[PDB]
Amino acid sequence: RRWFHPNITGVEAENLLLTRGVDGSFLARPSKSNPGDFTLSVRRNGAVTHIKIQNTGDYYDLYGGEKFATLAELVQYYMEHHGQLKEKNGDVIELKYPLNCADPTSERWFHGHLSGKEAEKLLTEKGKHGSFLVRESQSHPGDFVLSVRTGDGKSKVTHVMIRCQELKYDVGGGERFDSLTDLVEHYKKNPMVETLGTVLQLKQPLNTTRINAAEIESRVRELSKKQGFWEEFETLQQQECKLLYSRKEGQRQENKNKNRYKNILPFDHTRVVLHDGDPVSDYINANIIMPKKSYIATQGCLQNTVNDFWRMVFQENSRVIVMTTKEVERGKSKCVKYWPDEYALKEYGVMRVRNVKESAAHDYTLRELKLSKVGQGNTERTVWQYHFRTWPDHGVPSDPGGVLDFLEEVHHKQESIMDAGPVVVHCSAGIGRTGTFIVIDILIDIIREKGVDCDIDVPKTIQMVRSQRSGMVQTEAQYRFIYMAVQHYIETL
Ligand SMILES: CC1(N)CCN(c2cnc3nc(Sc4cccc(Cl)c4Cl)ccc3n2)CC1
Known part of the structure; x- marks a missing residue:
């Protein structure tokens, strides 16, 4: 990137x-x-x-x-x-x-101002064999240091001087590199060898984003000080060139008009495959997301994909749907109405849905739906649709309380249903708001079962979810909101 x-x-x-x-x-x-x-x-x-x-x-x-x-x-x-x-x-x-950038500030391994001994304590506490970082030199201005851990006594930290000469970087001999990134990439492939033999393998950057749940408030304060939030988010964005997985099925001619947006497609390797269709009937713009519960992340239904949506819900045994958009926002259609009116019954192809009862809260409407296959009354199951209605037209909610109380209710519904399938989550394109809700749910579920004695790593969690559907979590404001939601949840324990 x-x-x-x-x-x-x-x-x-x-x-x-x-x-x-x-x-x-x-x-x-x-x-x-x-x-x-x-x-x-x-x-x-x-x-x-x-x-x-x-x-x-x-x-x-x-x-x-x-x-x-x-x-x-x-x-x-x-x-x-x-x-x-x-x-x-x-x-x-x-x-x-x-046109390649030479700036290392968005690289996971670049720490800027960092003492040789501060880097040693970080590498001692969270470092592994091959964990590395690059820092400015504290004795030679303009120079840098590559600090690597290899391995009481069995492990060590080695500091390699990197000199900057005419905006080119080197480790004292050999090749001169146009950027720190090129230098790191080269000595990742061709690791340095020590005179006595130790191989300075650059295996992975030192993790600085995994913190203990009880440390969230402090970390949020730090990131709130060009702020840390922007820097961390852009560093996460810099990792997205690792996630260019294939999306061939969604580009097929027969599937093109099954996409709300022609270039926002499900990865082939995690897409939900629809299995017993009418004799191309296996496609829906949706991905399985796995972290205890799993999710399906999907777009708002189009008129011509409502039938396929209910086939998915039926086939995957999903019992909970989370809708995070109005049908219409700012006069634009973001999701067609794929459910019946309260007390009504409709057939969507071979699937039958009854809207049993709706219950309104301030932030959301709950719709108790009964889904079954036409011609087979023994297949009925209740699907609980949680339709979140108060997400603002611009930005993210100013307070996470409504989203958190919503997800807490959704979580308990799902947990109360024996052998329920993945929770369906959708917005418009199914990546921004949908990714934000799913990431918060994943993190909250760790804290719910572990309290404060657990690690949380927001950008690692997002990157893992981004490997199962493109672009999960769209913006820095959503990134920040995820941190704010986690902080608020930990504080109300
Ligand atoms: C000052 C900095 N230059 C930028 C901020 N700050 C970092 C450091 N690593 C970061 N890492 C990520 S993404 C990720 C996180 C965990 C595990 C895994 Cl595997 C991944 Cl890919 C996203 C943002 C980051 N931000 C320290 C270095």
């Missing part, structure tokens, strides 16, 4: 492309005018074009282009679909040459 530059301005992007790029070179960067948005900066015929990318919480919206689940999938799409990106006037913008 070298083409994303987290700390550059528009002017700096123009100069970088004009002095170090060619026609077809590109980078992406956060938008300094509109916080939370991003800009694609592309060079063409010796001129730079800036293309705005919005994310209000549901997807990345490329102005004059399509909607995507991550910046990496967006870049992958246009680099592999030439003449697909059109401009203002309608002319082709070619993304050909990523």
Whole structure:
């Protein structure tokens, strides 16, 4: 993900492309005018074009282009679909040459100001064999140190000096690298060997995000001090080029119109496969998400996917559905009404649904549904639809109390139902709000059964969920809200 530059301005992007790029070179960067948005900066015929990318919480919206689940999938799409990106006037913008960033601030292993002994205590406490980090040198300004743990007495910490000479980095001899990232990547593949023989293997960065549950308030205070939240979120975003798993089934011609957004697709390896269809009937835009409960993350139904939605719910034995959007928000349709009116009964293809009773709370409506296969009364089961209604049109809720009390009720419903399947969670595209609810539920469930004596690692949890559906958790404001929800839950114990 070298083409994303987290700390550059528009002017700096123009100069970088004009002095170090060619026609077809590109980078992406956060938008300094509109916080939370991003800009694609592309060079063409010796001129730079800036293309705005919005994310209000549901997807990345490329102005004059399509909607995507991550910046990496967006870049992958246009680099592999030439003449697909059109401009203002309608002319082709070619993304050909990523312009690599040299900034290490978004790398998991870069700690900046850190003493040799502070790094030793961190590596002693949370480090493993091959855990490493890079820090500024405390004696030679402008130089850095690579601190590695290999392995009382059986393990050690080795400090390797990295000198910076003319904006090139080296470990005292050999090759000179254009960035710390290149240096780390090289000595990851070609590990340094010590004179006496020890191999300084760079296996994984030192974890700094896993904390004890009781430490959340302190960590939140730290991140609240360009704030730590932004830095941690962007570092997580920098890992998304590891998650470009294939989505071939969703791109098939017969499945295209089963997607609310043509380029927001389920990974083939975790997609819910619909099994006994009408003699392509196996496709729905949905993924299994596994952390005790499992989830299905899915989009709001389209008119032509309501039948497939109920086949999924039936086949997977799901007994709880969590809907996190209104049907209509800001005059836009985000989910068709896939359930009957209270007391009514409808057939959706071969599936029959009765709306038994609705119960309203302030934050949500609960719909007691009875689902069965037509022609087979012995297949009936109750499906409890929790329709969250108070998520704001802009941003995230200011207080997590409503979301937390909602998930607490959903969790107890699920736990009270013997052998219930995954909980279905959906919004519009099924990645932003849907990922946020699912991540909070996963973290809360650890604390619910372990109290404060448990580790929580928010970005690791998100990355694990992002490997099972694209772009789970869309924004920094959602990232922050997840931390705020976890803090509030721990405090009300
Ligand atoms: C100052 C920093 N440069 C950025 C902030 N700060 C870090 C450090 N690791 C981070 N790591 C992640 S993602 C992840 C987390 C756990 C386990 C696994 Cl496997 C993954 Cl992939 C997401 C944000 C981070 N943020 C320390 C270094």
